[PDB]
Structure formats: C-alpha cells, structure tokens
Amino acid sequence: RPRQYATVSKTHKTVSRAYGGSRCANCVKERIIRAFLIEEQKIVKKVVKEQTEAAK
Amino acid sequence: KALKVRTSATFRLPKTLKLARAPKYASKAVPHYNRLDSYKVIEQPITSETAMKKVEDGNILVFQVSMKANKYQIKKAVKELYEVDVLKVNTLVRPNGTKKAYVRLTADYDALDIANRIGYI
Amino acid sequence: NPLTHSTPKNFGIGQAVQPKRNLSRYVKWPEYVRVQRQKKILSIRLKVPPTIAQFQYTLDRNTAAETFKLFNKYRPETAAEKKERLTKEAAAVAEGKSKQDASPKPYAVKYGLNHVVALIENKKAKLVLIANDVDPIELVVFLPALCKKMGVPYAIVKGKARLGTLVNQKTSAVAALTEVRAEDEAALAKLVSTIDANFADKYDEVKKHWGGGILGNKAQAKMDKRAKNSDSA
Amino acid sequence: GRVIRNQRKGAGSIFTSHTRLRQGAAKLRTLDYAERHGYIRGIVKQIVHDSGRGAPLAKVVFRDPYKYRLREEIFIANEGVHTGQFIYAGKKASLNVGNVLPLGSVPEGTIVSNVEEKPGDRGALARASGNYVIIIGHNPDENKTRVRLPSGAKKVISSDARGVIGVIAGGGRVDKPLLKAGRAFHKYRLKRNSWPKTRGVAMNPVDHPHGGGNHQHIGKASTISRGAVSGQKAGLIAARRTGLLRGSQKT
RNA sequence: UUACUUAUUCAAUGAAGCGGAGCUGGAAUUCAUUUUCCACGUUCUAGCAUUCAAGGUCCCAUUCGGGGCUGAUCCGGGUUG
RNA sequence: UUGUGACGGCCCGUGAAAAUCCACAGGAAGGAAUAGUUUUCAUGCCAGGUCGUACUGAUAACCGCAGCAGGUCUCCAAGGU
RNA sequence: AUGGGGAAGCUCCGUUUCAAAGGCCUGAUUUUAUGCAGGCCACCAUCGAAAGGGAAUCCGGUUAAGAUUCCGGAACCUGGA
C-alpha cells in the first residue's frame, strides 16, 4: 500500500537500471535507442541542410 | 530612471512591514490563575467494590477526575499529589457524566498503601 | 578552453523554453493603477473644451524655476520663527508699550484659494500662480478669467505639490504675490513681462482654442497606413 | 394550472447534466503565440471514451513554451488519430488529419472539425461524432472564411478561427437501433434527466396545454407562435410548415 | 450605407510576445534611394529540452568566483481579440 | 461459502474524486584519513491527546398512542433427502 | 463565507469569479534578531461519508456486568530526538 512503501528500504522499490523503479526495461531500452537514433538523425539533417545551403 | 524589470506578467501584493502588538493597556490586567491544578483535576477517589478490587489486585488507583482533564494532566497531578510514578492512565466518561480515571502505577509503588495513605482502605 | 562547449539555445517558436523577457508591457496591473492610466487616456482621447487645456499650458522650466526662486525669497514664516516673533512682540508690548507695531511688516507670498481669489477681486494681487494638478478642476478653472478681467498677471505652473512646498504645506493649489520688496521689484517686473506675454495677452486665443482629441499609437498608425494607401495614386 | 415540465427544466434541480464520469471539457489549445505564428507539436497520449459523449476524446500533451512544463489538452478525437501520433497546431501546421490549422491557412473544400466560432473560443462547431464543417471560400479582405455547417447552414467566420482537420470519430452511431427502453435508459442515465417522455395529451389540463378531454387530442393547432410565453410554448414552436415532406438536404 | 474609439457590450490568458521600426542574403520591374516576402534555424519515429544559460566581447584580486554588454534588436507601456 | 488468479462476454452504459505515500529524470550543495557520510541497513531511547465504547436491535428495549400478527439496513450459515 | 454585484431590506447570487487574495526551504542567526540585499514558488476558504478513501494488534486469561480497550505474553505504526 502507498504508505506501506514508506517503511521499506530503497532497494525494494527500484531496480539498478536507469529509470529503475519508474519504467520497464524494454521501454527504457526503446527510449535509449530512440534518443540516440534521432539525435544522430538530427545531426545528419543539419549537415544536409548546411550543405544544400552551400550549394545554393 | 528606467522602469523595474518585470519578468512575470502578474502583480502581487507587496510584502509590507508587519509590526507587533504594543498595547497601551493590558487586556485583562490580571493573569488568571491555573484553571486546572492538581486539586482540580484529581477531585476524589472512587471507592466502589470494583475500584477497590483494581486497587488491591491491579495496582490501579481509581479517581473521579475533572471532565476537562486529559491523561497528561491526570498523570502530572497524581505524580505531584501522591509522589508516585504512574505507568499508564485510562479514562472514561461515565453514564452519569463525570470522568473516571484508572491510573496504573509502576511496580515500585503499591496502590493499596497509597490508598490507605489517602484515607480509604 | 577545451572543456567549454557552445550550447546556443534556439528560441524558435517550438524549439526551446523562452528566456526571461521583460514583460512590463503585459503586467496585469491592480485596478487602481488601471483606473489611473485609463483616466489619463480618456482625458486625452476626449475633445476637451477650452477651459480645460488652457491649463496643461504650464510655464517652461527656467521661468518656473526663477519664479519659484523669487517666491522662496518670499516664503512665509515657519512655526519656529513665528513663535520667536510672538515672544519678541510680547516682550515689546511688555516693556516698550509699542502698539503692536514693534515687529516689522511681513512680506510673504499669499496662499489659500479663496483668500487669493479675494485678493484678485480687490486687485491686491501683483502676480498669481495657478496649479494644473487640482483634483477637481472647477476649483480654479475660472481663475484665469478672473485674472484677465481684473488685469492681474497670472500664470499656470506645474505642481500643486511644488506650490505647497513653496507655502510650506503639502499642496497649495494657488499662490499669489501682493507686495514686493524694492530690492527685487525689478526682478518681479521682468518676470511678469514674460508671464504676461505667455498667458494674459493670449487669453482670447486660449479661450477660443479647443484641446484634446488625440488617439493612441495604434490608431495613429492605422490612420497613417490608411492615408498613405489612399493618397498613393 | 400548473408549471409544466419544460418550464420546470430551467430551474436545474433534477435536470442538470450528470457530469461525474466526464473527462473534462474538450477544448482546443489556447491560442497563445505559436498557434498564430508558427506551429507546436504535441503527442496523443490516450484516446478515451467520454460518458454522455458519442465522440472519443484525445488527450494531447504539449510542451510549455515559456516554462519547463507539460500541458495536457483534451481534444475531440478525429477519425484516424491514434496514440503516439504527433499533432501539429498553428498557422504553419500542415494539412494533415488531427492538425489544428486556422481556416485562412486551410484551402477550399477542407474537412474540419471542432471549429472556433470566433478566434480563441477553443472550439464550438462540429463537435458531435461524425460531424464536420466544409470550407467553402475565403474573403482575404477583412479575412473571413465561409464554411458550411453540419446542418447545412452557411456561416461566415473569421479566418483566424482554429479547427481540427478531419471528421469526428464515433460516426455512424445513430445507425444502430436502440431496440430497448433499457438502452435508452442507459444512454440518458449519464446525459441528463430527460427520459422517459410522457405525452402532453396523456396528462390532465392542469399539467399541459394538450392535457384533458374525453379523447386524447391536442384540441387547438399544435403550431405555437414564437411570441408565445412559457407554458404556451408546448408543441411545434414557430413552425413554418408541418406534415411529412418529400425533400432533400437542400443545402 | 459606411468611418473613428473613448462610452457601453462580448471573449481569453498565470494579461507572453501587440503596433511600428529595423543586424542580416536574396525570390526578387529599382530609372540609379526597395513597396512586398522570406534568412528572424521546430514535420520520417510514444526519447530529451528547466538551475540569472553555454559560448562570445569588457573588467576584476582571483576564495565557494564572478560583475556589465551580448546571447535574447529598438521604440510606444494600448495584455489581446 | 469466501478470497485470489488467468481469461471470456456486454454496452449509443466502458463502470468517482481527493487527501496521502513512494519512485524516477535532473544534478544544486556538500564530503578525504585515527576520521568524514550514511538515522531509505541493523540495533538502541521517548511519546502517542480528545470524544464513542454497557445493552436491545425487535411477535417486549426502534416507529406505528401499546410489551401492536405491521414496518425497519447488514455479516456468519452444520447433516440427510 | 470572502472579492464583487443585486435588493428598501430581511437577504439573493457567486466560489475563481473585472481581487494588490499566501505559506515554505535553507542561511541570517545574540554590535539589534527571529529582522533581511538568501531562495523557491502561486493553491482559491471551508464544510460535506461512524457503509467511500485511510498509519499501525494479535493470542490466551480475566468481570455480576467492560474488553481487538484490562492483565500476561508477543508485535506493529506515526512523530521526535
């Protein structure tokens, strides 16, 4: 129960991974992959826009 | 010169100074005496057969108590009045409308001896 | 140098959280502030009849400063010197039996609205200054007409608070000189010449001239744009 | 006589709407700066059923532009909107289902829903399931978009009035017969206390203009004047014609 | 019939970006002096955007580091319709 | 019989809110060595007030003029047929 | 209730409304304090359930009549140091 959570230690309420006690392993992995992939895509799109402006 | 920078578009009531009361005369001019002293919270014992049983076997003094007295006040009053350490206080408002307190003393004290010191065997 | 990096935040429409801009233009002001500002705005927008805005024609800074310098020379007596004067005259009447003329004749500025109005009526007023800050304008709205009829030099000056500071108060709303000392009668005359040229002899023009009627800057821009695209043929 | 049912319905004692299970007022995003100069991207988190409402609602989360916050707006879900979809709201938004472009920015013949009657009212028109608004034309001078309403009426709205592209989900709901006083009961149990409906002819003359008689009959013409008063306005109010008409949409 | 806005009236927001003016390069009929508009960085993805902001100029006693300017244009204080 | 679990059916009906508690993102701030931090690990110390609490709950403790064949919400629920 | 607006008025509406609407973290912290050039924010009063939501107790014994309340034993929670 919510107040019962106050008497237990921190280990019982979380997992050692990032976003441990908040998000599941698969969702954390999906958002890591998403972050890395679309920041790389942001770099690619920025480079392509700069080079097309140079061409223009 | 320039106007004050207002990064919030809201206006709040400024924190003006709040002085402390400095009366020119006392409100009531005489502090009332203690409205609940030991002699008021501890009115009298209860000397029914059941209460005497609690005294003789349970090491428990049974008192009629001021209806406005709580367990802290009863404990303090019993300690101040009979020079005894108490272990627990239980209270109940009786069907006749008065407060009744079962005060259990520590094992270092004898309720029977304290009762026959008070005057009721 | 190799440890620091160029962040720059992009403040586009959907890019980054906006930084703390000065939003004083958009403050949700209290109602009293809002009523102050809108009272000003409405007085400006409404066509004011000549009797208003024959005020708001105050003197310029330098002539107002020299007028108030002369009047500070003619400042009234404060509580301390007044009480000292009372003690001195009491001692005088006690010892020399002088008929209450031991103390000299005061030379002071005359203040008080109805006192000064009576002074203009009896033509004792050598010069009169009228504030433009009077909360009900009708208290003094007639005063330039009275000064014109009586032929007494009048001016409209900025600050009932300034006049009050002159006559040793918070707010005088009018001041008047009736007597001048010989040492600065010339200064008063040279002041009155310009005061008169600015106010007394322009009385008919200022009584004919209608004031007010200005719009706000957005409305001015609107009529500017409309006029430009109209006369563009 | 007596105060009749339609008169009693305005005091709102037992006739107020049952709003416990509702999911909040479905309103467009506040027209702040981005909605009228560029666009803003929100994300559709969940599409939910709203009690008393045939259309699904969509909860869309936007980023606060002026502070580090998330703002959850409650939208009327358009057909084809799904969870995880990106919604774009603003003048610069693209013509896609679920976007909140202004009428001036959408072209003629566009299907829009949750359209604002005035710019900033956060959605007034075409909000029931399956309903939409057609963009008929533009008047760029004193910008006014002409639209066609779900009833067939032609309206002239400001060109800055927002609206979601597409049609409203839950369409075709009234094609199913209820089949049951039970289904009607459960429908209205969370709309409001307007069902069942007793006929006025089945009442007494104290209770209704139609009540009374030794047969159940209205007695006088059931078409009531627009200038009639409360207690008189029971029947066909300001009817231009009556009877079964063979006709079309005529719009 | 129609114009003004300031009375009155309607609506929204935590009154946040209104009106106008412009660092900037051009798509681009300029008679040698730009009317417009865009450059004033967001659209394949259920990620993340916050610590007077990093950087960049100017300065310091330089001790938990900072202080102006700029980043983040200026003017009008008509919150906006 | 009760509780629980994984499921399946129904709806133009999809079947409260808030207090409260925890967690995560972030990284402000602070921290060495005969001693710092950890009171989300274990142990140890103190206190926990006020009011109700008996009994009936019905063919006699309630309402119906009553110790009235009436009315008045609910939990437990053995064997055989 | 308040702000505000009606009503001759008893009072009516209204509950975030055209309001200048507060409490909450750590330093100041005994030349003077709980001031303040420390900092964070910006809820709409309140009442409303002894069947809704909720911090924590069980067994045995004990009375003429109370007990998950007393006693014996064995625990748990909250708030403090």
Side-chain angles (χ1 to χ4, degrees), chain A, chain B residues 2-121, chain C residues 1-96 101-233, chain D residues 1-248:
Chain A
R1 303 304 280 186
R3 269 266 273 255
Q4 218 149 88
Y5 277 119
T7 79
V8 302
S9 32
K10 202 169 160 66
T11 278
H12 290 159
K13 311 189 249 188
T14 184
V15 190
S16 312
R17 194 187 35 258
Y19 287 88
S22 179
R23 276 150 188 44
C24 68
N26 288 44
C27 261
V28 159
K29 144 177 164 81
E30 190 224 281
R31 76 160 42 203
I32 297 160
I33 281 140
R34 162 94 42 57
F36 169 84
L37 278 193
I38 100 151
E39 67 114 19
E40 277 284 278
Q41 225 300 291
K42 257 181 197 49
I43 308 169
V44 150
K45 108 191 308 174
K46 157 161 65 63
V47 158
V48 101
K49 183 161 82 133
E50 188 269 356
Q51 69 102 40
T52 193
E53 290 323 301
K56 259 61 152 189
Chain B
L3 307 150
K4 147 166 280 302
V5 151
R6 311 198 68 124
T7 53
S8 208
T10 84
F11 195 94
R12 319 258 74 101
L13 184 71
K15 214 78 64 210
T16 70
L17 173 63
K18 272 190 228 311
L19 281 173
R21 276 207 171 159
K24 301 227 174 317
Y25 57 98
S27 292
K28 63 154 50 161
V30 164
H32 195 284
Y33 50 91
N34 186 2
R35 279 158 201 98
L36 251 201
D37 61 346
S38 55
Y39 307 101
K40 197 119 64 204
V41 351
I42 296 291
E43 290 183 352
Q44 71 159 224
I46 287 142
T47 325
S48 78
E49 163 219 287
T50 329
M52 293 318 300
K53 212 71 38 73
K54 307 226 165 19
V55 161
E56 285 220 355
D57 291 340
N59 199 48
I60 286 170
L61 295 176
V62 182
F63 288 127
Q64 177 162 330
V65 149
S66 151
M67 207 193 345
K68 322 168 91 147
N70 61 43
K71 295 179 173 194
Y72 304 121
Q73 273 154 2
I74 292 157
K75 166 152 175 136
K76 219 188 55 48
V78 173
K79 183 174 334 313
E80 289 209 359
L81 231 51
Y82 308 118
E83 296 81 53
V84 289
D85 317 342
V86 332
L87 184 83
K88 168 137 109 173
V89 167
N90 291 19
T91 61
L92 63 97
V93 179
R94 275 179 309 181
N96 61 45
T98 77
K99 219 147 172 163
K100 171 207 237 182
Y102 308 98
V103 189
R104 163 117 175 260
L105 311 157
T106 37
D108 310 9
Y109 290 98
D110 204 24
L112 211 175
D113 294 320
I114 274 291
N116 56 63
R117 156 184 169 200
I118 288 147
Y120 66 105
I121 275 285
Chain C
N1 181 18
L3 275 189
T4 67
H5 190 45
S6 194
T7 284
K9 278 172 224 186
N10 187 237
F11 292 130
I13 270 184
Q15 260 285 335
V17 166
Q18 302 289 327
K20 295 311 127 213
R21 235 153 289 182
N22 163 40
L23 303 178
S24 320
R25 203 189 92 88
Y26 313 98
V27 176
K28 192 195 177 192
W29 294 103
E31 282 172 18
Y32 86 102
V33 174
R34 193 169 335 148
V35 179
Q36 277 175 171
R37 314 248 184 89
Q38 285 187 239
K39 204 230 270 203
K40 211 166 127 193
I41 262 53
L42 181 76
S43 285
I44 274 167
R45 304 273 192 284
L46 282 196
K47 256 172 71 62
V48 315
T51 326
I52 286 95
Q54 51 112 336
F55 287 82
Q56 83 144 40
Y57 283 15
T58 56
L59 292 171
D60 91 323
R61 297 195 58 259
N62 219 285
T63 174
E66 76 170 79
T67 303
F68 292 150
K69 182 193 244 46
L70 175 64
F71 278 50
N72 221 62
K73 278 210 313 306
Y74 279 120
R75 200 199 270 283
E77 38 157 19
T78 45
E81 62 203 51
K82 149 102 165 145
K83 150 173 54 167
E84 148 62 339
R85 189 193 59 75
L86 273 311
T87 72
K88 154 171 324 194
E89 190 64 23
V93 306
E95 74 94 14
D101 286 345
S103 40
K105 162 215 210 327
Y107 273 93
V109 61
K110 306 303 199 177
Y111 57 121
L113 175 56
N114 43 25
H115 169 38
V116 164
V117 163
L119 284 167
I120 291 116
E121 262 156 47
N122 311 33
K123 288 289 330 205
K124 330 276 213 161
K126 250 61 177 314
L127 169 83
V128 47
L129 310 171
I130 312 178
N132 63 329
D133 283 89
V134 289
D135 254 334
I137 192 57
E138 314 142 301
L139 272 289
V140 303
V141 99
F142 71 96
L143 257 179
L146 171 62
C147 299
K148 158 85 180 143
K149 177 145 298 165
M150 299 276 84
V152 22
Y154 81 95
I156 302 195
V157 315
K158 219 174 261 199
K160 62 189 180 171
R162 218 173 170 193
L163 285 178
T165 317
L166 206 145
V167 317
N168 196 101
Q169 313 226 257
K170 303 198 299 206
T171 285
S172 153
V174 116
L177 276 189
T178 74
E179 318 258 340
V180 77
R181 291 200 271 258
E183 55 197 339
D184 59 80
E185 157 89 57
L188 170 74
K190 89 199 287 144
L191 181 51
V192 163
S193 197
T194 92
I195 293 327
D196 216 284
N198 236 305
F199 281 106
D201 36 42
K202 292 213 154 241
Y203 173 83
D204 321 85
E205 281 332 281
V206 305
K207 146 188 261 299
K208 143 89 181 42
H209 178 222
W210 268 80
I214 308 116
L215 275 35
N217 72 296
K218 295 192 177 26
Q220 327 264 36
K222 255 176 147 161
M223 56 66 162
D224 273 26
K225 278 216 187 346
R226 157 166 79 234
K228 266 258 298 163
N229 60 54
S230 66
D231 71 4
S232 303
Chain D
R2 208 205 287 267
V3 170
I4 68 178
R5 170 165 37 80
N6 74 54
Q7 285 193 261
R8 294 197 283 114
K9 275 165 94 112
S13 98
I14 49 145
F15 299 111
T16 53
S17 68
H18 319 158
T19 44
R20 170 184 58 114
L21 298 171
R22 299 218 218 300
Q23 293 284 333
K27 293 148 122 53
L28 287 182
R29 189 180 131 84
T30 267
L31 172 64
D32 43 353
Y33 170 84
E35 257 80 39
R36 52 165 153 84
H37 289 289
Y39 57 86
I40 193 181
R41 186 252 283 294
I43 174 82
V44 171
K45 286 292 173 91
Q46 46 195 336
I47 307 150
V48 287
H49 162 74
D50 195 40
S51 309
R53 180 183 257 113
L57 295 190
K59 329 284 277 202
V60 194
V61 166
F62 292 84
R63 298 212 350 273
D64 196 304
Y66 310 104
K67 182 184 18 186
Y68 178 72
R69 262 224 67 92
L70 290 180
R71 309 292 199 180
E72 199 178 16
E73 307 296 278
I74 277 70
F75 275 52
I76 291 198
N78 272 10
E79 206 155 326
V81 152
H82 56 99
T83 51
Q85 175 176 341
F86 287 139
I87 289 329
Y88 301 86
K91 213 218 178 188
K92 274 182 82 283
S94 78
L95 214 67
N96 271 269
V97 158
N99 293 352
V100 202
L101 300 80
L103 304 183
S105 42
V106 310
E108 274 137 305
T110 313
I111 324 303
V112 261
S113 76
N114 205 356
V115 182
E116 275 170 8
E117 271 194 317
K118 310 209 215 116
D121 82 31
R122 308 185 67 179
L125 311 163
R127 315 183 77 230
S129 65
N131 281 108
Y132 53 101
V133 157
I134 302 301
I135 303 263
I136 293 173
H138 292 115
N139 270 132
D141 319 316
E142 190 40 54
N143 51 339
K144 282 309 185 20
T145 302
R146 268 139 36 227
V147 312
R148 204 219 38 106
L149 296 171
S151 66
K154 311 299 170 303
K155 197 176 185 134
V156 174
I157 308 160
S158 165
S159 266
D160 310 272
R162 269 109 44 86
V164 196
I165 311 276
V167 281
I168 317 199
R173 174 172 35 84
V174 293
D175 292 344
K176 191 155 156 204
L178 287 158
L179 276 198
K180 276 163 76 189
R183 301 270 182 86
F185 163 87
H186 281 295
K187 169 198 226 263
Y188 289 106
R189 164 181 65 81
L190 38 66
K191 318 195 85 155
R192 68 204 69 73
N193 185 206
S194 74
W195 184 95
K197 226 166 299 273
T198 307
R199 293 172 281 103
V201 286
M203 326 207 159
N204 296 127
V206 60
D207 307 290
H208 203 270
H210 295 355
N214 287 342
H215 307 272
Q216 266 189 26
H217 73 297
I218 296 172
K220 299 255 187 180
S222 51
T223 55
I224 312 288
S225 164
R226 176 79 73 197
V229 306
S230 322
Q232 285 190 327
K233 272 194 180 145
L236 310 178
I237 288 125
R240 310 169 220 278
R241 60 153 293 134
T242 36
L244 175 74
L245 66 162
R246 319 164 161 116
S248 160

